[PDB]
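ligand=calcium ion
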Amino acid sequence: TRKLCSLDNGDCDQFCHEEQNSVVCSCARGYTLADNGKACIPTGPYPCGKQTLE
Amino acid sequence: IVGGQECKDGECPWQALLINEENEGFCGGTILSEFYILTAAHCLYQAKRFKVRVGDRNTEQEEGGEAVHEVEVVIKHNRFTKETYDFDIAVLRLKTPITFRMNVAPACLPERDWAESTLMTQKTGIVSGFGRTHEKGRQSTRLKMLEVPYVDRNSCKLSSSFIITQNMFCAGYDTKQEDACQGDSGGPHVTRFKDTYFVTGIVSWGEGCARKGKYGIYTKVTAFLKWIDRSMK
Ligand SMILES: CN1CCc2nc(C(=O)N[C@@H]3C[C@@H](C(=O)N(C)C)CC[C@@H]3NC(=O)c3cc4cc(Cl)ccc4[nH]3)sc2C1
Ligand SMILES: [Ca+2]
Ligand SMILES: [Ca+2]
């Protein structure tokens, strides 16, 4: 039965790691973890992994 | 790329193209950062001197966003071997930093365990390049992309005439006519996760292109994440 990082990536936008019995989220270089500890916010222009829209 | 679709504006911005002395593309690469291109080791032998073009989608036209960068350092995996194409991975440091802009931007490096558990278990990845549009054909003047299923590792080993090492994985289709092809080699295989694209492979080799019972063979980027880290210092 899927728990933690196996249940929908733990609600993380990007990297999910299981510590003790809890989900810990993190983010690629160039992103900052948001205050909710789950979302990843780009710290600057042209963040990695995003198709360009301008 | 055999099949698939053109990369539309902004869609494949991490694509690099290695160009020889005749300004002709012979291999692909993935933009990792302003200074570093991921490509395949076997691509280094395809030309004595070469540069890296980024921002290009149509080789027949100068659409303004293109830029050529000279290579400063070539960092080839020391265990690369031509006979099996095992450890088929190289990083290039550029002399001048890439300026990110429309059509020019890096793919993300994932963390190993997450990538293996979560990216490489997704249904598909995406491969792209200017390579041949069918086995016997000429290279494409348009950047193409193609969704390719991950392939069960045992099927891949049974499909294959040559050894599939743990530094490789397989993707593509059993009989459907869509695959990477010659000239795409060295280019990206990325996996999307919530609208963010992570590098998961390097185009390495196939037994022809899109043959029935045959798959695309990619370098397994997650086996080399420490090594890429080191190479980028
Ligand atoms: C252990 N070996 C490693 C290298 C290799 N190349 C082989 C080959 O047939 N190559 C072609 C003829 C080869 C050739 O011209 N020879 C005279 C051997 C040149 C390259 C060709 N490569 C491709 O067509 C190619 C590259 C590629 C990449 C991916 Cl991901 C999917 C499909 C795919 N198709 S078979 C083989 C086995
Ligand atoms: Ca062009
Ligand atoms: Ca096939």
